[PDB]
Amino acid sequence: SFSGYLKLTDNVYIKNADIVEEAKKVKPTVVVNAANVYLKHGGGVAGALNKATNNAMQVESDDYIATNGPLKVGGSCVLSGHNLAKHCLHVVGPNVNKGEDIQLLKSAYENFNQHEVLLAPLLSAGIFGADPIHSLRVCVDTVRTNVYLAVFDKNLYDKLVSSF
Numbered sequence: 001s002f003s004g005y006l007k008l009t010d011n012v013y014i015k016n017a018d019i020v021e022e023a024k025k026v027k028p029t030v031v032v033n034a035a036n037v038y039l040k041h042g043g044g045v046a047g048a049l050n051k052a053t054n055n056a057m058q059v060e061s062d063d064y065i066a067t068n069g070p071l072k073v074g075g076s077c078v079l080s081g082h083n084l085a086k087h088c089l090h091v092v093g094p095n096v097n098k099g100e101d102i103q104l105l106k107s108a109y110e111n112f113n114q115h116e117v118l119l120a121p122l123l124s125a126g127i128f129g130a131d132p133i134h135s136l137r138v139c140v141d142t143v144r145t146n147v148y149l150a151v152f153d154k155n156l157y158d159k160l161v162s163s164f
């Protein structure tokens with residue numbers, strides 16, 4: 001059901017789209033969230049996905065943290081996708097604006113290999129502060145399963161495709 005995506009490799013596809021609108025249209029098995037270790041979904045992709053769930057994502061996330069403690073940078077957990085997908089894979093890429101190690105970006109993308117197909121944002125890009133051209137290269141060199149990337153910023157999408 002994914003449509004209008006540009007094929008970058010055998011398994012990586014990309015589109016200039018709002019991941020919330022894409023998830024509402026496709027209802028994928030898995031939507032990836034650009035999470036932090038506390039699952040505090042304030043801004044960026046996380047804030048937008050949580051708002052689309054009417055805060056149900058944050059209520060579920062707070063119960064998960066109260067039981068399990070925080071995730072590791074480079075780690076993930078599978079929770080409900082609520083009204084957006086069957087599941088949400090919350091993945092923690094390093095936040096360069098918080099001083100985190102960019103070398104953990106490959107470990108973050110490895111979580112995608114546990115799922116046959118995913119709708120996802122570009123990890124550690126945007127307000128997480130990493131070079132998005134680097135994030136796209138690590139994605140295509142790490143993920144082996146079928147990944148549909150939704151890039152919100154139009155200017156960024158154009159820059160990523162022309163430089164790929």
Ligand SMILES: O=C(O)C[C@@H](NC(=O)c1ncnc2[nH]ccc12)c1ccc(F)cc1
Pocket residue numbers: 017018019020034044045048093121122123124125126127128150151152153156
């Ligand atoms: O412009 C971009 O694609 C990069 C940016 N993505 C979004 O904020 C983004 N991407 C897709 N759908 C969206 N809907 C509402 C926001 C949103 C970003 C990626 C990872 C991250 F950790 C933080 C931000």
